């Protein structure tokens with residue numbers, strides 16, 4: 001099995017790219033896949049599950065008890081046979097936001113879930129901080145490969161660069177490698193060129209350019225991933241290609257992060273003095 | 281002294297709104313202010329300090345020691361007499377990202393820094409997670425008032441809503457209150473009306489609408505806050521008014537958070553279907 005962690009800044013498109021890429025792997029490429037939601041937002045599986053807000057592993061632990069919390073009570077199966085779990089976690093301020101991820105991965109590992117007839121496991125992880133459970137995929141070797149969803153936004157590059165920093169520190173001991181950056185387009189001029197340049201500075205590849213397509217919201221309104229909603233539309237075929245590239249990917253590196261000054265220079269070069277990158 | 285925490289998602293404009301609002305408080309309203317950077321990005325004060333890259337207290341503690349990590353070595357004064365400090369944080373994956381914030385605020389409190397001839401203390405706080413040091417102004421009573429910078433972005437409203445959740449759990453005991461939402465414009469039609477209704481839903485006020493103005497980047501190139509760069513331009517006057525509104529504010533509430541589905545319903549109502557607010 002190949003264990004893949006997906007990182008990126010909040011709102012960048014982690015759950016959209018993960019669910020649709022996973023949907024494509026199952027529907028187009030005949031893969032058996034597992035999504036482990038590792039973001040407190042806890043909607044990383046709702047489209048695969050056609051709207052169902054999955055009971056989190058932390059909520060099951062709370063309500064059912066340590067003596068009764070088993071993987072079968074937290075795994076749900078949805079589109080394409082994709083198995084889903086949501087880690088959950090403490091409410092805001094109650095405790096470590098990433099505590100639920102730690103408890104959830106541990107239980108999954110104890111029972112061999114990731115090893116049970118799967119080609120791929122995808123972790124959909126919060127990347128605005130790299131600590132606690134959110135750093136497990138990089139630091140403790142819980143994932144083999146990492147892909148980062150990014151855009152021309154400064155904070156998107158910042159988030160990607162911080163995961164690279166975590167990798168410089170732990171990857172030689174943990175075995176995790178960087179498979180590349182995914183440009184999730186916001187339809188802003190220069191985003192592709194910027195991220196291609198970013199990838200070259202840190203020593204990775206820009207694996208795919210996912211276009212902006214409001215079919216994503218059309219399918220969301222029907223509680224479906226794009227590949228589920230219409231498997232012949234352009235966006236579904238874009239995810240079919242992104243899935244093929246991941247499946248076929250052999251480019252796996254330990255990156256060389258950039259400095260903050262280098263990051264400012266790169267965004268200024270492409271007209272994003274306003275880090276929010278609203279216009280190219 | 282009034283201790284104010286500024287929350288919001290990364291890139292929303294917390295450090296810009298804070299530095300320019302604080303610069304307006306000191307320059308236009310003769311207020312003595314302290315800025316405490318509580319974001320690991322650690323550039324919350326460079327405009328007040330005219331580009332100076334501050335040494336973080338956690339870096340100082342590491343190189344000098346606790347007996348020597350005194351506020352005199354970490355506090356710096358810049359435009360309008362504003363005192364500045366950066367908490368710092370561990371490197372990615374090394375430890376709790378908010379640990380520096382706990383140690384920093386603790387040291388500043390034990391030395392009476394916030395009580396030393398100050399009208400306002402502003403904490404510029406990372407809000408994408410609400411835990412560790414980042415939760416101290418909500419849970420532990422280290423702030424009196426909160427303002428969230430937001431926009432039409434779904435995750436901006438989500439971040440604001442998570443602060444509300446933290447307040448429902450702790451604000452009665454901690455004494456913190458919500459002073460309002462600040463809308464940092466993304467120049468997207470309907471943003472103001474969306475945030476207005478959002479404020480109405482949770483029981484607060486949309487205290488001010490800060491326009492998007494590229495004079496901000498012009499002043500940044502000069503290493504200055506807008507008010508410092510040009511105190512007569514329209515954006516400087518916008519921060520003058522936001523500063524006035526905060527000084528005079530008495531609408532301080534404990535809000536009612538919305539559920540995830542209510543938030544999706546609300547953004548869809550106003551045409552913000554793609555939650556990235558770009559168009």
Ligand SMILES: Nc1ncnc2c1ncn2[C@@H]1O[C@H](COP(=O)(O)OP(=O)(O)O)[C@@H](O)[C@H]1O
Pocket residue numbers: 008009010011012013014015016017184185210211212213214216217220434553554555556
């Ligand atoms: N390629 C795309 N085209 C159109 N909309 C997108 C695309 N990718 C993401 N989105 C939208 O952007 C918003 C953020 O996506 P999401 O997956 O929830 O981000 P994250 O999981 O990183 O927080 C959602 O409203 C989603 O519909």
Ligand SMILES: Nc1ncnc2c1ncn2[C@@H]1O[C@H](COP(=O)(O)OP(=O)(O)O)[C@@H](O)[C@H]1O
Pocket residue numbers: 273274275276288289290291292293294295296297464465490491492493494496497500
């Ligand atoms: N009112 C505004 N007009 C123009 N640009 C702005 C405005 N507010 C923020 N910005 C820009 O947006 C980017 C993010 O601002 P920043 O304060 O760093 O956000 P945060 O501190 O929340 O991460 C910066 O490049 C800044 O220049």
Ligand code: SF4
Pocket residue numbers: 095096097098099129130131132133375376377378379409410411412413
């Ligand atoms: S380790 Fe990270 S997620 Fe946990 S309390 Fe600290 S900042 Fe929050």
Ligand SMILES: [Ca+2]
Pocket residue numbers: 423424454455456
């Ligand atoms: Ca108080």
Ligand SMILES: [Mg+2]
Pocket residue numbers: 014015016039041043044124
């Ligand atoms: Mg998500």
Ligand SMILES: [Mg+2]
Pocket residue numbers: 294295296319321323324404
């Ligand atoms: Mg900031």
